[PDB]
Design an enzyme around this catalytic site. Structure first.
Site, PDB file in Angstrom:
ATOM      1  N   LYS A   1       0.840  -1.220   0.000  1.00  0.00           N
ATOM      2  CA  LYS A   1       0.000   0.000   0.000  1.00  0.00           C
ATOM      3  C   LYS A   1       0.873   1.269   0.000  1.00  0.00           C
ATOM      4  O   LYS A   1       0.388   2.388  -0.220  1.00  0.00           O
ATOM      5  CB  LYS A   1      -0.959   0.020   1.214  1.00  0.00           C
TER       6      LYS A   1
ATOM      7  N   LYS B   1      12.436  -3.794  -0.292  1.00  0.00           N
ATOM      8  CA  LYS B   1      11.116  -3.194  -0.170  1.00  0.00           C
ATOM      9  C   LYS B   1      11.236  -1.693  -0.062  1.00  0.00           C
ATOM     10  O   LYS B   1      11.963  -1.171   0.787  1.00  0.00           O
ATOM     11  CB  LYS B   1      10.376  -3.741   1.042  1.00  0.00           C
TER      12      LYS B   1
ATOM     13  N   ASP C   1       3.972 -11.418   8.408  1.00  0.00           N
ATOM     14  CA  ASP C   1       3.425 -10.224   9.039  1.00  0.00           C
ATOM     15  C   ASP C   1       3.864  -8.961   8.304  1.00  0.00           C
ATOM     16  O   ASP C   1       3.642  -8.823   7.101  1.00  0.00           O
ATOM     17  CB  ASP C   1       1.897 -10.297   9.090  1.00  0.00           C
TER      18      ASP C   1
ATOM     19  N   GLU D   1      -2.222 -15.721   2.492  1.00  0.00           N
ATOM     20  CA  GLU D   1      -1.598 -14.718   1.634  1.00  0.00           C
ATOM     21  C   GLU D   1      -0.456 -14.040   2.338  1.00  0.00           C
ATOM     22  O   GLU D   1       0.414 -13.446   1.701  1.00  0.00           O
ATOM     23  CB  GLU D   1      -2.607 -13.680   1.176  1.00  0.00           C
ATOM     24  N   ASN D   2      -0.420 -14.194   3.653  1.00  0.00           N
ATOM     25  CA  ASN D   2       0.661 -13.622   4.434  1.00  0.00           C
ATOM     26  C   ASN D   2       1.690 -14.656   4.842  1.00  0.00           C
ATOM     27  O   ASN D   2       2.569 -14.366   5.644  1.00  0.00           O
ATOM     28  CB  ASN D   2       0.125 -12.904   5.662  1.00  0.00           C
TER      29      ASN D   2
ATOM     30  N   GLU E   1      14.246 -10.920   3.519  1.00  0.00           N
ATOM     31  CA  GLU E   1      14.476 -12.261   3.014  1.00  0.00           C
ATOM     32  C   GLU E   1      13.604 -12.456   1.783  1.00  0.00           C
ATOM     33  O   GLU E   1      12.489 -11.933   1.703  1.00  0.00           O
ATOM     34  CB  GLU E   1      14.081 -13.294   4.081  1.00  0.00           C
ATOM     35  N   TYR E   2      14.140 -13.187   0.809  1.00  0.00           N
ATOM     36  CA  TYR E   2      13.422 -13.527  -0.419  1.00  0.00           C
ATOM     37  C   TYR E   2      12.941 -14.965  -0.253  1.00  0.00           C
ATOM     38  O   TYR E   2      13.737 -15.846   0.112  1.00  0.00           O
ATOM     39  CB  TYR E   2      14.369 -13.470  -1.629  1.00  0.00           C
ATOM     40  N   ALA E   3      11.641 -15.190  -0.458  1.00  0.00           N
ATOM     41  CA  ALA E   3      11.053 -16.523  -0.314  1.00  0.00           C
ATOM     42  C   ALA E   3      10.765 -17.054  -1.711  1.00  0.00           C
ATOM     43  O   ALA E   3       9.766 -16.718  -2.325  1.00  0.00           O
ATOM     44  CB  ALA E   3       9.774 -16.432   0.503  1.00  0.00           C
TER      45      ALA E   3
ATOM     46  N   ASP F   1      -0.963 -12.222  11.928  1.00  0.00           N
ATOM     47  CA  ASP F   1      -1.940 -12.473  10.868  1.00  0.00           C
ATOM     48  C   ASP F   1      -1.325 -13.594  10.029  1.00  0.00           C
ATOM     49  O   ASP F   1      -0.321 -13.382   9.341  1.00  0.00           O
ATOM     50  CB  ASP F   1      -2.116 -11.214  10.014  1.00  0.00           C
TER      51      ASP F   1
HETATM   52  C1  LIG Z   1       7.464 -14.832  -2.392  1.00  0.00           C
HETATM   53  C2  LIG Z   1       8.249 -13.693  -3.011  1.00  0.00           C
HETATM   54  O1  LIG Z   1       8.192 -12.556  -2.153  1.00  0.00           O
HETATM   55  C3  LIG Z   1       9.252 -12.315  -1.187  1.00  0.00           C
HETATM   56  O2  LIG Z   1      10.191 -13.095  -1.143  1.00  0.00           O
HETATM   57  C4  LIG Z   1       9.168 -11.124  -0.284  1.00  0.00           C
HETATM   58  N1  LIG Z   1      10.015 -10.691   0.689  1.00  0.00           N
HETATM   59  C5  LIG Z   1       9.530  -9.539   1.246  1.00  0.00           C
HETATM   60  C6  LIG Z   1       8.309  -9.202   0.601  1.00  0.00           C
HETATM   61  C7  LIG Z   1       7.997 -10.203  -0.401  1.00  0.00           C
HETATM   62  N2  LIG Z   1       6.895 -10.157  -1.174  1.00  0.00           N
HETATM   63  C8  LIG Z   1       6.037  -9.126  -1.017  1.00  0.00           C
HETATM   64  C9  LIG Z   1       4.788  -9.054  -1.880  1.00  0.00           C
HETATM   65  C10 LIG Z   1       4.369  -7.584  -2.088  1.00  0.00           C
HETATM   66  C11 LIG Z   1       4.103  -6.866  -0.763  1.00  0.00           C
HETATM   67  C12 LIG Z   1       5.320  -6.904   0.116  1.00  0.00           C
HETATM   68  O3  LIG Z   1       5.514  -6.029   0.944  1.00  0.00           O
HETATM   69  C13 LIG Z   1       6.291  -8.041  -0.016  1.00  0.00           C
HETATM   70  C14 LIG Z   1       7.470  -8.046   0.863  1.00  0.00           C
HETATM   71  C15 LIG Z   1       7.117  -8.097   2.292  1.00  0.00           C
HETATM   72  C16 LIG Z   1       5.889  -8.530   2.791  1.00  0.00           C
HETATM   73  C17 LIG Z   1       6.040  -8.471   4.176  1.00  0.00           C
HETATM   74  C18 LIG Z   1       7.349  -8.014   4.362  1.00  0.00           C
HETATM   75  S1  LIG Z   1       8.149  -7.768   5.890  1.00  0.00           S
HETATM   76  C19 LIG Z   1       8.130  -6.101   6.387  1.00  0.00           C
HETATM   77  N3  LIG Z   1       7.415  -5.209   5.698  1.00  0.00           N
HETATM   78  C20 LIG Z   1       7.578  -4.066   6.381  1.00  0.00           C
HETATM   79  C21 LIG Z   1       7.054  -2.790   6.168  1.00  0.00           C
HETATM   80  C22 LIG Z   1       7.342  -1.781   7.069  1.00  0.00           C
HETATM   81  C23 LIG Z   1       8.174  -2.032   8.159  1.00  0.00           C
HETATM   82  C24 LIG Z   1       8.721  -3.297   8.363  1.00  0.00           C
HETATM   83  C25 LIG Z   1       8.415  -4.323   7.479  1.00  0.00           C
HETATM   84  N4  LIG Z   1       8.765  -5.629   7.461  1.00  0.00           N
HETATM   85  O4  LIG Z   1       8.032  -7.755   3.230  1.00  0.00           O
END
Ligand SMILES: CCOC(=O)c1[nH]cc2c1N=C1CCCC(O)=C1[C@H]2c1ccc(Sc2nc3ccccc3[nH]2)o1
Length: 249
Positions: A19, A38, A148, A134-135, A85-87, A130
């Site tokens: 967002k 990110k 999260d 999807e999370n 981390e990349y998943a 959560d």
């Molecule tokens: C499966 C392929 O995706 C990934 O590997 C991956 N790693 C990190 C993310 C992510 N794939 C996506 C999809 C699009 C939305 C989004 O934010 C992410 C991102 C992510 C999702 C959750 C987090 S952890 C995190 N976000 C933060 C925001 C503010 C402050 C601290 C935070 N820690 O990172």
């Protein structure tokens, strides 16, 4: 303290949209490891701030193989960058959509990994995660990662305006276990108002393919009275879990 800069990374494909900005696959130039970068736009981020703040803090102190890692961060004047981390296996939600439902082995294994991560979280005083599909991300080994990271799953105490505690995570685990085996969460309905009623009365049905051991586990976790839900250790020791999980706790 380690200072990172945009220039340290080779930006790759976008992995998705938050967002507040985009996420890209990235390679750190020296090591060549691969990670997610990110991006959060400082501006709309005040449209709040210093929370996330809490967020980077929390995620930084959590160190578990089933919790998405935050390696560090840096920022400029419209951007804050999170080195995550990349998943590589994507989301559990994607996997569920593709299979329609999970077998008992896959489900019990995911539930084991989640109960372990949640038990670690609780040990560090972090609660109310959560863990909707999807999370949940998947590592290189197919291992689940709680991601999260700054209604179907809300427990009765929450929707009934009472106070809640760490027992909310047990309710979440039950809704998740049902969704994994069935392909949909248990209280799903047309209107929010009908879903609220279902949750409040813990009104849900089991498809015939849901076995005896799975029903016992789900029903215990989805107890209206939070104090009646099992402890995480009891989930990990549940016979349906120890029969089906492809990994030890
Ligand atoms: C499966 C392929 O995706 C990934 O590997 C991956 N790693 C990190 C993310 C992510 N794939 C996506 C999809 C699009 C939305 C989004 O934010 C992410 C991102 C992510 C999702 C959750 C987090 S952890 C995190 N976000 C933060 C925001 C503010 C402050 C601290 C935070 N820690 O990172």
């Amino acid at each position: 303290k380690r200072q990172w800069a945009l220039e340290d990374f080779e930006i790759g494909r976008p992995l998705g949209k938050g967002k507040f900005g985009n996420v890209y696959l990235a390679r750190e130039k020296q090591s060549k490891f691969i990670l997610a970068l990110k991006v959060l736009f400082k501006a709309q981020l005040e449209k709040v701030e210093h929370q996330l703040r809490r967020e980077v803090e929390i995620q930084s102190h959590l160190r578990h193989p089933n919790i998405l890692r935050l390696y560090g961060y840096f920022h400029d004047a419209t951007r804050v960058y999170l080195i995550l981390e990349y998943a590589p296996l994507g989301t559990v939600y994607r996997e569920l959509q593709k299979l329609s439902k999970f077998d008992e082995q896959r489900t019990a294994t995911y539930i084991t990994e989640l109960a372990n991560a949640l038990s670690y979280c609780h040990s560090k005083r972090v609660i109310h995660r959560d863990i909707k599909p999807e999370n949940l991300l998947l590592g290189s080994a197919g291992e689940l990662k709680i991601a999260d990271f700054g209604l179907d799953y809300l427990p009765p105490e929450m929707i009934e305006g009472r106070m809640h505690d760490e027992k909310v995570d047990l309710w979440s685990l039950g809704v998740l276990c049902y969704e994994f085996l069935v392909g949909k969460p248990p209280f799903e309905a047309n209107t929010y108002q009908e879903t609220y009623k279902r949750i409040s009365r813990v009104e849900f049905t089991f498809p015939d393919f849901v076995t005896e051991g799975a029903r016992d586990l789900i029903s215990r976790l989805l107890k209206h009275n939070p104090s009646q839900r099992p402890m995480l250790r009891e989930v990990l020791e549940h016979p349906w879990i120890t029969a089906n999980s492809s990994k030890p706790s």
